[PDB]
Amino acid sequence: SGSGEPREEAGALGPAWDESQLRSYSFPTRPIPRLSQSDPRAEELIENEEPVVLTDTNLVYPALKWDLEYLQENIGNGDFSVYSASTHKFLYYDEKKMANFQNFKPRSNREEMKFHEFVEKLQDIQQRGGEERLYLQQTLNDTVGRKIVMDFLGFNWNWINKQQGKRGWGQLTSNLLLIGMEGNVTPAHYDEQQNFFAQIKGYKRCILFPPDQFECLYPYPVHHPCDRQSQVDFDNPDYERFPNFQNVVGYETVVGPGDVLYIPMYWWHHIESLLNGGITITVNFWYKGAPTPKRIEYPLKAHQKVAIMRNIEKMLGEALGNPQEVGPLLNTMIKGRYN
Amino acid sequence: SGSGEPREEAGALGPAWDESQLRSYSFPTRPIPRLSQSDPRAEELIENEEPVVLTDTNLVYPALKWDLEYLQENIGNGDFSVYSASTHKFLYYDEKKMANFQNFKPRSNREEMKFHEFVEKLQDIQQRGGEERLYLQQTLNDTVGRKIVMDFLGFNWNWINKQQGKRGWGQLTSNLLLIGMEGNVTPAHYDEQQNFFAQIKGYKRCILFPPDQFECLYPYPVHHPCDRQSQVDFDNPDYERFPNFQNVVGYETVVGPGDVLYIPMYWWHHIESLLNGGITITVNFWYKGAPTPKRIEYPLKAHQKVAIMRNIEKMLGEALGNPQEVGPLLNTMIKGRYN
Ligand SMILES: O=C(O)c1ccc(O)c2ncccc12
Ligand SMILES: O=C(O)c1ccc(O)c2ncccc12
Ligand SMILES: [Fe+3]
Ligand SMILES: [Fe+3]
Numbered sequence: 271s272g273s274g275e276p277r278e279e280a281g282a283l284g285p286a287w288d289e290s291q292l293r294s295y296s297f298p299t300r301p302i303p304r305l306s307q308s309d310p311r312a313e314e315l316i317e318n319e320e321p322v323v324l325t326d327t328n329l330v331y332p333a334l335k336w337d338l339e340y341l342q343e344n345i346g347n348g349d350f351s352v353y354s355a356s357t358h359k360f361l362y363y364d365e366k367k368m369a370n371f372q373n374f375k376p377r378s379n380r381e382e383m384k385f386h387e388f389v390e391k392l393q394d395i396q397q398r399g400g401e402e403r404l405y406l407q408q409t410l411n412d413t414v415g416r417k418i419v420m421d422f423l424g425f426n427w428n429w430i431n432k433q434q435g436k437r438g439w440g441q442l443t444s445n446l447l448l449i450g451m452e453g454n455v456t457p458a459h460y461d462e463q464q465n466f467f468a469q470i471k472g473y474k475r476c477i478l479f480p481p482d483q484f485e486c487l488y489p490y491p492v493h494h495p496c497d498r499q500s501q502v503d504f505d506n507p508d509y510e511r512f513p514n515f516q517n518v519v520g521y522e523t524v525v526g527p528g529d530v531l532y533i534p535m536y537w538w539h540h541i542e543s544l545l546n547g548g549i550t551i552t553v554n555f556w557y558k559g560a561p562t563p564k565r566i567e568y569p570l571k572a573h574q575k576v577a578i579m580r581n582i583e584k585m586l587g588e589a590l591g592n593p594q595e596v597g598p599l600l601n602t603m604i605k606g607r608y609n
Numbered sequence: 610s611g612s613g614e615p616r617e618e619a620g621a622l623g624p625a626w627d628e629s630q631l632r633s634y635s636f637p638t639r640p641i642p643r644l645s646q647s648d649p650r651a652e653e654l655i656e657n658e659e660p661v662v663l664t665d666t667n668l669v670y671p672a673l674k675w676d677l678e679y680l681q682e683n684i685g686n687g688d689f690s691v692y693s694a695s696t697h698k699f700l701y702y703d704e705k706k707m708a709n710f711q712n713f714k715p716r717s718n719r720e721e722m723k724f725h726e727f728v729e730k731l732q733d734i735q736q737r738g739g740e741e742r743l744y745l746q747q748t749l750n751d752t753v754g755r756k757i758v759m760d761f762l763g764f765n766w767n768w769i770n771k772q773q774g775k776r777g778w779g780q781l782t783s784n785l786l787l788i789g790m791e792g793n794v795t796p797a798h799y800d801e802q803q804n805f806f807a808q809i810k811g812y813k814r815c816i817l818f819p820p821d822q823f824e825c826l827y828p829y830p831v832h833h834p835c836d837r838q839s840q841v842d843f844d845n846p847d848y849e850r851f852p853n854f855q856n857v858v859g860y861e862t863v864v865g866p867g868d869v870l871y872i873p874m875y876w877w878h879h880i881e882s883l884l885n886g887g888i889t890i891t892v893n894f895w896y897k898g899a900p901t902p903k904r905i906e907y908p909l910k911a912h913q914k915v916a917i918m919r920n921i922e923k924m925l926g927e928a929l930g931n932p933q934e935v936g937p938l939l940n941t942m943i944k945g946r947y948n
Contacts, residue, residue, distance in 0.1 A: 488945040501945070512945050568930045578928050579942045582921060589917050591907045597947035603918045604943065606827040606840070606851050608936035 272299045273475060273524040286526055287473050291544040293455075295504055296516075299477060302523040302531070307429065316437065319534040321478050323523055327530045330468045330553055332424030334527055337471065338549065341418075341449075342389050348413035349382040353405045358455045358542075359505070360405055363495035370493045370593040392451070405456075406449040410553070430466065430555060439464050440558030448552045450543050458487060458540040459499040460576075463556045467531035472543060472550030476531055477522040479538035482572035484579075486518040487538055492583035493593035504540065535559045536573035611638045612814060612863040625865055626812050630883040632794075634843055635855075638816060641862040641870070646768065655776065658873040660817050662862055666869045669807045669892055671763030673866055676810065677888065680757075680788075681728050687752035688721040692744045697794045697881075698844070699744055702834035709832045709932040731790070744795075745788040749892070769805065769894060778803050779897030787891045789882050797826060797879040798838040799915075802895045806870035811882060811889030815870055816861040818877035821911035823918075825857040826877055831922035832932035843879065874898045875912035 273292065276285040304323040305312040315322040353360055361378040368374055383391075388406055395402055410422065434442065443463055452472075458479065467476065479487060488511075490496040502512045509516055524544070525531050533539050543550040586600070587593040612631065615624040643662040644651040654661040692699055700717040707713055722730075727745055734741055749761065773781065782802055791811075797818065806815065818826060827850075829835040841851045848855055863883070864870050872878050882889040925939070926932040 485941045485944065491946055514945075570929065575929075575938060578925070579938065582925065582942065586917070586921065590909065590914075597943070599914060599918065600939070600943050600947050602824045603921065604936070604939050605824065606853075607830055608939050 272301065272522050274301050277524075277526070287524060287544055287547060291473075291547055292475055292524075293505075293542060293545070295477075296507060297518045297520060299520040299522040302476070302478065302521050304523070304529075313436075316433065316532050319537075321521055321523075321534060321537065322532050323525060324530040324532070325528065327426055327429055328528075329426045329430060329466070329530050329555075330470055331426065331528075332421035333468075333470050333551075333553065336421070336551055338389050338392075338449075342385050344415035344417040345385045346413050346415045346418070347384055348408075348411065350385055350388055350406055350408040352381050352383055352388055353378050353407060354381065355403050355405070356401065358403060358453050359457050359503075360403075360455065361457065361496065362499075364497060365495070367493060367495045367497065371495060374495055388449075395451075403451050403454055405451070405454055406447070408447050410445040410447055433466075434557055437464070438560035440560070443556045443558055446554045446556070448550075448554070450550050452543050452547050452549065453545050454550070455542040456540070457499055458502070458504065458538050460489075460536050460538045461498070461533075461556070462535055462559070464535045464559050465533040465557075466555040467525065467533055468553045468555065469525040469527060469529045469531070470551040470553060471527060472548055473524050473526045474550055474552065475522065475524050475542050475544060476533075477520045477540040478533065479518060479520045479540075480572065481536040481538075481576055483518055483538065484572070484576055486512075486514040488512050488515070491593075491596065492580050493587050493596065500538065536576055611640065611861050613640050616863075616865070626863060626883055626886060630812075630886055631814055631863075632844075632881060632884070634816075635846060636857045636859060638859040638861040641815070641817065641860050643862070643868075652775075655772065655871050658876075660860055660862075660873060660876065661871050662864060663869040663871070664867065666765055666768055667867075668765045668769060668805070668869050668894075669809055670765065670867075671760035672807075672809050672890075672892065675760070675890055677728050677731075677788075681724050683754035683756040684724045685752050685754045685757070686723055687747075687750065689724055689727055689745055689747040691720050691722055691727055692717050692746060693720065694742050694744070695740065697742060697792050698796050698842075699742075699794065700796065700835065701838075703836060704834070706832060706834045706836065710834060713834055727788075734790075742790050742793055744790070744793055745786070747786050749784040749786055772805075773896055776803070777899035779899070782895045782897055785893045785895070787889075787893070789889050791882050791886050791888065792884050793889070794881040795879070796838055797841070797843065797877050799828075799875050799877045800837070800872075800895070801874055801898070803874045803898050804872040804896075805894040806864065806872055807892045807894065808864040808866060808868045808870070809890040809892060810866060811887055812863050812865045813889055813891065814861065814863050814881050814883060815872075816859045816879040817872065818857060818859045818879075819911065820875040820877075820915055822857055822877065823911070823915055825851075825853040827851050827854070830932075830935065831919050832926050832935065839877065875915055 276287050279286050302321045302323055303311070303315065304325055307324045307327045312322050312324055353362065355361065355378050363376065363378065388404070392404055394400065460481070487500040488502055490499055490501055502515050507515050523531065583596060587596050590596065590599060615626050618625050641660045641662055642650070642654065643664055646663045646666045651661050651663055692701065694700065694717050702715065702717065727743070731743055733739065826839040827841055829838055829840055841854050846854050862870065922935060926935050929935065929938060
């Protein structure tokens with residue numbers, strides 16, 4: 271069914287959200303299980319690298335207070351990466367890879383600024399009834415206000431640290447603070463690290479796809495700036511170019527304040543802030559996955575095959591001396607021989 | 610035009626052969642230049658790795674005498690690999706790779722036997738008006754008769770050894786004695802070693818294709834028993850499966866007693882013994898090519914790209930643990946992403 275029947279907020283404050291706040295798509299979805307961190311099942315899902323929503327971790331308990339006013343007040347004077355877009359879909363791209371593809375034009379520009387500037391430009395759009403959408407995504411560093419350092423320390427490091435150990439993951443690569451406008455959408459894509467999506471303010475609809483649905487999502491070429499993202503426009507899927515998108519089946523859920531969504535590495539994920547649901551705030555915890563076992567066991571995992579394909583592409587671009595030639599060589603290699 | 614106007618034999622013994630002895634094919638061809646070993650051009654072609662027919666090397670001068678009677682008389686009692694076929698096309702195959710592909714049925718069986726047995730079974734087919742064709746292909750070793758050792762030593766090792774040095778090639782990997790029936794055909798394929806085709810008895814039509822015509826020839830998958838051979842049936846080309854075969858352009862020539870044809874490594878080659886031209890005898894000299902230069906210069910050579918594709922296939926089959934899965938992964942990797 272999807273995110274299932276809208277949850278009821280405590281104190282009879284009404285339903286947290288309603289179906290009209292969710293965007294419409296052409297594919298079916300099964301619900302991600304919402305469990306308690308003390309539930310053996312949740313521990314089982316995380317181990318078998320499957321998504322799960324933990325409702326009682328208290329991971330970012332101290333931040334549940336956060337809002338635009340509180341943050342602008344105690345966040346600091348550091349710079350904050352802020353992405354913009356003319357549409358609800360934010361098209362991020364690896365700048366370092368822009369060299370490879372020339373005909374590439376940026377649709378999502380980045381810009382550094384002080385928090386008060388973000389809150390400002392955010393307000394201008396409100397009254398001016400603007401169309402421009404903004405999305406703040408900045409790593410949490412020492413340049414943050416004292417109080418924030420208190421909240422940061424308040425996180426349930428006890429719990430997350432145990433998870434990091436029980437799964438044999440690597441070190442916490444980074445923490446990301448995301449603050450977005452209602453309706454904001456992060457197009458389907460996958461990451462190579464294990465992620466804990468800690469929802470703080472507002473609600474976000476999360477739609478995940480297993481790694482084995484690689485052939486239904488059609489990720490951009492590895493050397494392309496949009497590497498790891500799906501080429502398929504979920505709002506207007508081109509079934510002629512991407513026929514297998516008609517076979518895609520996802521797992522979805524709506525996370526709210528206090529919920530932690532485990533997004534396994536290599537798992538595709540589409541994230542959107544509910545329509546007319548106000549701003550959203552999230553903090554992600556990214557951990558390098560566990561080291562690859564010595565004795566390579568077969569059958570091979572889907573994410574492993576994905577890794578293999580990425581390497582073929584990288585090496586090939588290395589050998590040929592030009593990423594632009596990867597496509598022609600691959601075609602030449604399969605045409606009339608493997609297809 | 611192809612092999613051009615038939616050459617005139619000395620002593621007014623008439624034309625060496627006539628066009629009706631050559632099979633008919635759907636592709637055009639340019640003639641391979643026949644030059645003298647003392648001709649600077651020939652030295653230029655061999656250096657730039659292009660085919661050339663040397664008419665005066667005297668490479669296998671002592672063998673120009675050889676025939677079935679002389680050989681059966683002084684060749685020895687060793688075993689001789691003899692391939693058979695129900696058609697004029699000999700379909701060789703790597704037995705060690707037969708494991709990979711199960712549905713593969715042998716069309717060209719091999720069999721060891723004494724030379725006198727080969728000459729015998731060869732005669733039975735004559736009077737019995739049989740259909741079975743035979744092709745003897747055996748490496749020249751010490752188990753050969755004394756006289757043959759004299760002839761072998763008689764070869765112009767002086768010349769070939771200088772070539773091996775001037776080109777920086779590796780050691781002579783092997784020598785192959787080939788004796789085939791008229792009409793016999795060795796389907797288009799390529800080898801990874803430098804080859805000197807020394808014609809001894811009869812005439813053979815040689816049709817070569819540059820390495821850059823890989824996409825027109827459609828070689829079998831690397832793990833397939835017929836690795837390195839073209840899937841295209843030259844007698845009945847399936848233009849639907851192999852559309853680019855309609856763009857193939859070869860280099861051809863007819864070599865006779867005393868001629869040496871340089872067949873560069875990776876160059877495709879189709880060899881056939883002229884129709885109603887009697888038996889043919891040839892001796893090939895195979896040398897590993899020169900070592901790959903340290904500083905990889907670009908643009909890359911076509912044979913280098915071919916090498917790169919072969920490796921991608923090998924490694925991929927290694928990683929996946931099963932050659933049968935190479936095709937599906939490659940398709941998945943390009944479909945909707947590179948084509
Ligand atoms: O927008 C998000 O909340 C989000 C969630 C999870 C991710 O991996 C992201 N990666 C890049 C940009 C945004 C996100
Ligand atoms: O049939 C031939 O004369 C011949 C010539 C050159 C080759 O590389 C071959 N390889 C395998 C079998 C036969 C051949
Ligand atoms: Fe991401
Ligand atoms: Fe060969």
